[PDB]
Design a protein around this ligand. Structure first.
Ligand SMILES: [Cl-]
Ligand SMILES: [Cl-]
Ligand SMILES: [Zn+2]
Ligand SMILES: [Zn+2]
Ligand SMILES: [Zn+2]
Ligand SMILES: [Zn+2]
Lengths: 92, 92
């Protein structure tokens, strides 16, 4: 089950726009409106992707005022992404 | 391009058997024969998955005697996987 859950985590990340969303969130937590604005994605699209990411426990949301603010779920997720980005960058 | 490459990395990991292969390799570097034996996967299957993993630079291979020995590409990959496994395990 552990490895099946890990599989689900990686499957959730296997998408360019979701990676763009994750990366933006690694810079700062954000509302849907802000994510859409920053990434030139529609709010309906962003909401759909976040639902998917949230189901896979890679992003979380908290309520500020009456708005949901999204962030990477926790440090493990942040570390996974930062290490992956770095890995993609260095010479092979 | 960086984020497209990261996308390709995560897409490569989005599979249960490939995760099982990665996890085994995190324990110890291994030949195809050994991976197949340990995971109850066929050698032809294992070879196919490794080609895919290698193309995505998540595993590497070195020659010992006249056999190829596979390992996780490097520490970033190891860290990504270990942090993901841990994330999957802890309470949500
Ligand atoms: Cl869009
Ligand atoms: Cl098989
Ligand atoms: Zn922890
Ligand atoms: Zn690396
Ligand atoms: Zn490094
Ligand atoms: Zn975690």
């Amino acid at each position: 089950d552990t490895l099946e859950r890990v599989t689900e985590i990686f499957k959730a990340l296997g998408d360019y726009n979701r990676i763009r969303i994750m990366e933006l969130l690694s810079v700062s937590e954000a509302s849907v409106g802000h994510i859409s604005h920053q990434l030139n994605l529609s709010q309906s699209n962003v909401s759909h992707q976040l639902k998917l990411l949230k189901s896979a426990h890679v992003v979380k949301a908290k309520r500020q005022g009456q708005s949901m603010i999204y962030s990477l779920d926790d440090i493990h997720v942040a570390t996974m992404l930062k290490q992956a980005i770095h890995h993609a960058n260095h010479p092979k």
